């Protein structure tokens with residue numbers, strides 16, 4: 001049983017969601033006025049804190065909590081080390097709601113003990129195309145289309161409870177208070193992802209990694225020298241040769257994205273993302289925020305032909321603490337972010353992403369099999385990793401879809 005999640009408006013079993021055919025709310029309709037105006041009660045030794053995610057010292061406080069207590073791999077070899085600059089970027093997009101950043105601290109010393117963050121997103125999340133088809137066959141098209149319009153919902157991430165406070169049921173409380181604050185803004189859905197299985201994902205995809213620094217990856221035991229490299233003479237030279245990349249990008253026309261590229265990037269991105277069942281909608285302000293280059297944070301390159309932007313890719317940086325190891329403290333990872341190709345095959349565009357990342361000092365490039373990420377796996381030498389990333393809605397009935405029908409990247 002799930003003492004918490006059984007109380008929530010989410011489907012409860014894989015069996016419930018296999019039956020779902022239309023997109024729509026799960027819960028009773030409610031109004032801002034129904035929602036308690038005061039924070040959810042917590043123990044008197046604690047207090048709720050809304051950090052100011054533009055005060056360097058509050059960012060630093062969140063930074064430390066996540067550095068020491070946020071997501072690790074299943075073998076506790078790595079832990080994400082999101083940077084302060086990354087956290088400010090991810091938590092403060094245009095029109096963000098400071099109240100959706102929710103922390104608990106110890107009343108005494110103000111030691112930060114838990115956090116969860118919501119940000120706004122405009123998401124297309126109506127009935128998927130294949131259900132809309134069945135709907136038509138059956139005369140149920142208006143039902144199928146009722147929730148087609150993009151919705152302003154909340155994106156939740158960075159849920160974290162201090163290692164000392166684990167399994168004390170604090171995470172349900174964080175989630176309830178976040179839910180209250182968001183509802184008080186008259187928002188009734190959320191989208192979130194996790195590596196863990198909860199009730200109940202609408203989509204799940206494997207991770208993929210592309211070695212850029214295989215000697216470092218083997219040394220930290222992220223990668224192995226596969227047993228076929230055994231009956232070879234000097235494995236590490238072969239491994240390095242297998243993953244070697246050009247020193248410079250191959251697409252003439254490639255350069256970093258510029259603020260004046262914003263309208264064209266927006267158009268080619270929206271045209272592309274619009275083909276997926278679930279995906280965000282971005283204004284020019286959101287394209288500038290999420291895609292303009294920002295040092296050590298996000299890296300975005302466009303292909304410009306005939307003074308026109310016809311393709312682009314982006315990746316973002318999240319270092320991980322290497323937990324065991326002598327020689328290394330940090331793993332430097334690039335994650336494929338949004339992209340669009342109109343003039344070249346997708347593998348030729350993403351090869352330049354790998355070349356750039358490698359040339360800028362990244363050890364590995366990671367992604368999940370959403371978008372059309374599967375279309376370049378084999379040719380660019382990506383391998384399936386261990387985790388699955390599961391996608392979830394809160395308060396939204398949604399049929400099970402494949403991850404290749406998902407166009408929302410989660411930071």
Ligand SMILES: CCCCCCCCCCCCCC(=O)SCCNC(=O)CCNC(=O)[C@H](O)C(C)(C)COP(=O)(O)OP(=O)(O)OC[C@H]1O[C@@H](n2cnc3c(N)ncnc32)[C@H](O)[C@@H]1OP(=O)(O)O
Nearest residue numbers: 002003004005158159160161166167168169170171188190
């Ligand atoms: C409309 C607006 C809606 C807004 C909110 C929408 C929903 C947002 C939902 C949150 C989206 C987060 C997206 C991300 O950020 S995913 C990343 C989550 N963070 C980490 O994994 C960091 C390392 N771990 C921790 O900090 C803690 O272990 C956490 C905080 C994960 C659990 O703390 P703890 O280990 O001390 O356990 P507990 O005794 O306090 O609580 C036990 C309950 O918590 C349920 N649990 C465990 N892991 C997760 C999980 N990742 N999402 C949702 N629920 C989770 C679990 O099934 C159980 O309930 P139930 O099985 O008894 O029923």
Ligand SMILES: O=C1CS[C@H](c2ccc3[nH]ncc3c2)N1Cc1ccccc1
Nearest residue numbers: 071072073078079080207320385386387
């Ligand atoms: O820092 C962390 C904590 S959990 C996440 C991670 C680690 C190993 C993985 N294998 N497959 C997915 C996956 C995710 N991760 C980032 C990462 C990505 C690639 C290699 C090492 C760490």
